[PDB]
Assembly symmetry: C2
Homo-oligomer: 557 residues x 2
């Protein structure tokens, strides 16, 4: 048998098979399996040599991943699944993996039933330093089993600290994964990991490769049987596909929600734009803002940049005094304090953005403390909505910090200064200044303080959300005005490609691509078709990306 | 001289006159004066006898006052200023007070200039137990000097504890009086008090008569000179009147402002009314509400009462458990704790409603602590608007109460239980129940806890305020839905006429007239033309009026 002999003889053993089936039944957080030394060692070694010689990999980055890919449409990589002339051992490998013998074994052990022999579906990738793939579930088309076979250097151990682990996520409830994974596989040469695609449950990611090493892998799927094949059921594939395509936005936090401003605030903006800030007001603004941006010609420049670009990208936004305070407290927190790296360890005043197939980061919203570990925790928040109060948040912090005891390890100097900044941007006078720059009258606000931790945190490309309560107001612009004050004290972002960049783009469609920097302020007027995200922050980053995020509904006045 | 001899000879003395003028210059909070034993003692005694015999007084109550009046249009009281046939001594009194001799003296001493001799303007009133007149400034028409001459029993001293004192208010800024008066006059027989009418400043009230005594007084005004009189200037009166008829609503607190609800909340209301509450939801509601109002026929009755009356007046609203908790903590606070009786003594979590010519009461709004003693205090609040957070307010209370030390004199058991109630009414599920009862979908909320102190607190007849931000939404009803949960544990309200009643009326125009009671819930859908106030609470009340005030914008769904 020229097929069975290309695999480890153990997999053909009935006792081993039942042993594997049981392992998979008993696995967590959802059913998955692994086999060590799957394939004939010579075969896989020759496949790896073929790949190194014949295939050229191109790095590709999106919001969701960074991967060295080989699946370019025109087959410039050297990989063509219709013509493996230069890769005969790879041909052999595909053949054995989709053989009847292997499919019967694999379908039995995973309890997946029958599998297509003809619908071969494989891709070849390498992960180098900084490469990663963010949380997803693999539920696409006729995919029934997901697999990865790993081909790192066959003569060295691939270690935990190298990263690139495969990580699996428990679920708070269907289609809502918990933020933190509960299992991680560190995979060696000739190891395969796999699982039955479970819509709503099979959430996994690839942990960033943290080290200067190349990790080659062959990824693939087994599909529902096609016409003419064993186990083929007419209608099954279509039934499956449509049944895998609302209520879920309830489980997202923080909410993309703005609170309306008081009458006092709005009439101050209206009055001004029916152009003039008093000297007392400039004095209040100069507490925080750089004099460059408060001068008459400075303001005039900003105003005209906004008319032209419908955006501002301001450098050295905050004055020297406040810039120095903030840099000192943020730097001190980064270098001398420990940072929570699991959502259960996050304490007041911080919250974890959830769910992880949409985003992950730490934020201060000014709301009552919230730590979402169960459906119950979430349902409770939804029954008892509260609104931000920064001064109370500030108060609470002082209680905790003062007993405790205000040491270099546990102080809240960063948080306190950041909240004072948030308070300044919450002030009536600041919003008057905003209206001055933009000729737009703010009618609502949401202010968030954000930390994007190295090796954890990210958002994905999304649109703004309007409130349908304000949709019928004809004065209200069909746009959300969005501010980002970046306070990232570390370097190497652009050169090391460390991620953490703020990206705005149209449905070159790129409006802004800004690596994190110190004391910049971006202002973007977003219509419905503008996408924004901040790229996943690499483990190699020397600090978190810290910023203050601001969102306003506006009318023209 | 038959006029000069009807007054105390001292007033004709130059030295006395300059002495009085100086007193008035040096008085506070604005210039005012008093003269003891003004009139010939026999004259005033005979005037008082005439009044008792000839004039019949009718009690009259509005939002602003309760006074025994004699100025009925048809002159049924016996008082007719055009025919004082039966009151010749009163005729004499009016004559002397508006004589040239007296006017010259009075105009000199008050620095008011010339005064009309012919435009006599006097009214006669008695204040009995519970009578009072709330804060006002007297700036009406051609009024130049305001005066009161007091005719209590000439042979007994009128004491402080009797009440009926004349009280004068300092100003936080023009037309914004401070909540608490800074001077009080206890007036005797034949005493006159007076002041130049000062638009924006001359704020005064009449302290409630706290005792079972009758206090007769003659009130009057000196007006700008009319045609043909000394000091007459053509155009002056009209210039004055028009120049005494916006920015001021900034100095009112609390704001008539509602915050918009989250998307999660609104879609729950929409979904339900596109009729059905789950058993888990009824279980949550039964934590607080009486089972009478949660049953299917109970609900059905409420629903139909609301369709008919556009209001509900529910008795025994809260269940026995919560009713008993609340009664115990409120009663305990009333009988064993001291209550702040000046706005400077009010502590967290309480705020004082201001300004006092619009309202006075204590409230819990869930916002950061605020105590308005200066313009600065107010300006600061307006530059830094915050939103309610009840849980943080609750947290802060525990800090203060626990050190401190949780005694019978200083505990916050009332406040804590009341806030828990406020939290329940802030819950998504309660608002679902509200929508069930009303077939209206709440889109915003404001919740306040109120205490109306005996002898201090009141509101005046006002309309609801819509937000013009939501005016263009066609789904949004042109009405404010308003709830009042009354938790007043004391009796005697209706029989003692102790005020504190909730009054709703059309521009019989009376919709609701409800004396305070225990555990009632009123619901009123107010259009623009519905007026509401709660009547000033008498010193004789055995407790404050305690309630929870709720306001929602609604759409029809
Ligand atoms: Fe995957
Ligand atoms: Fe008066």
């Amino acid at each position: 048998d020229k097929i069975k002999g290309m695999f480890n003889p153990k997999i053909w053993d009935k006792t081993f098979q039942d042993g594997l089936k049981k392992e998979i039944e008993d696995s967590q957080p959802y059913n998955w399996g692994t086999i060590h030394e799957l394939v004939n060692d010579d075969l896989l070694r020759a496949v790896r040599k073929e790949i190194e010689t014949e295939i050229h990999f191109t790095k590709k980055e999106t919001d969701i991943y960074r991967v060295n890919q080989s699946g370019d449409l025109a087959n410039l990589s050297g990989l063509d699944w219709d013509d493996l002339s230069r890769l005969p051992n790879l041909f052999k490998l595909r053949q054995i993996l989709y053989s009847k013998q292997y499919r019967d074994f694999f379908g039995y052990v995973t309890k997946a039933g029958k599998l297509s022999g003809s619908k071969t579906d494989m891709s070849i990738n390498t992960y180098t330093k900084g490469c990663h793939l963010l949380t997803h579930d693999d539920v696409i088309g006729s995919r029934r089993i997901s697999f990865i076979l790993y081909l790192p250097d066959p003569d060295r151990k691939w270690k935990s600290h190298y990263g690139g682990g495969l990580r699996l996520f428990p679920s708070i409830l269907p289609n809502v994964p918990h933020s933190d994974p509960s299992a991680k596989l560190v995979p060696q040469f000739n190891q395969i990991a796999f699982f039955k695609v479970l819509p709503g449950f099979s959430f996994h990611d690839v942990e960033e490769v943290k080290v200067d090493k190349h990790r080659l892998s062959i990824q693939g799927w087994y599909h529902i049987p096609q016409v003419g094949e064993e186990g083929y059921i007419p209608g099954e594939e279509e039934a499956w596909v449509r049944n895998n395509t609302n209520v879920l936005e309830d489980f997202e936090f923080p909410k993309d929600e703005r609170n309306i401003l008081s009458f006092h605030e709005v009439k101050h903006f209206e009055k001004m734009l029916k152009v003039k800030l008093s000297e007392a007001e400039f004095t209040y603004l100069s507490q925080y803002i750089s004099p460059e941006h408060l001068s008459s010609k400075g303001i005039e420049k900003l105003q005209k940049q906004f008319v032209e670009n419908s955006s501002l990208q301001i450098e050295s936004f905050l004055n020297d005094d406040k810039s120095e305070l903030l840099k000192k407290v943020i730097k001190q927190k980064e270098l001398e304090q420990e940072c929570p790296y699991h959502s259960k360890d996050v304490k007041a005043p911080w919250k974890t953005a959830i769910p992880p197939h949409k985003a992950r980061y730490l934020y201060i919203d000014g709301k009552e403390y919230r730590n979402f570990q169960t459906e119950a925790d979430i349902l409770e928040a939804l029954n008892n909505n509260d609104l931000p109060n920064f001064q109370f948040t500030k108060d609470a912090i002082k209680i905790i910090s003062d007993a405790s005891g205000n040491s270099r390890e546990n102080n809240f100097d960063a948080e306190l200064a950041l909240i004072d900044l948030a308070v300044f941007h919450k002030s009536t006078i600041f919003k008057k200044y905003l209206a001055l720059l933009t000729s737009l009258c703010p009618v609502s606000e949401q202010i968030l303080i954000r930390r994007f931790r190295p090796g954890m945190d990210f958002t994905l490309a999304t649109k703004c959300r309007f409130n349908e309560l304000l949709k019928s107001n004809p004065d209200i612009i069909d746009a959300v005005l969005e501010g980002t004050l970046c306070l990232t004290p570390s370097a190497g972002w652009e050169s090391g490609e460390l991620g953490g960049y703020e990206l705005y783009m149209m449905d070159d469609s790129v409006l802004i691509n800004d690596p994190p920097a110190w004391n910049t302020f971006n202002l973007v007027l977003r219509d419905e078709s503008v996408l924004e995200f901040v790229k996943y922050v690499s483990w190699s980053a020397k600090s978190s990306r810290w910023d203050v995020k601001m969102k306003w509904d506006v009318k023209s006045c």
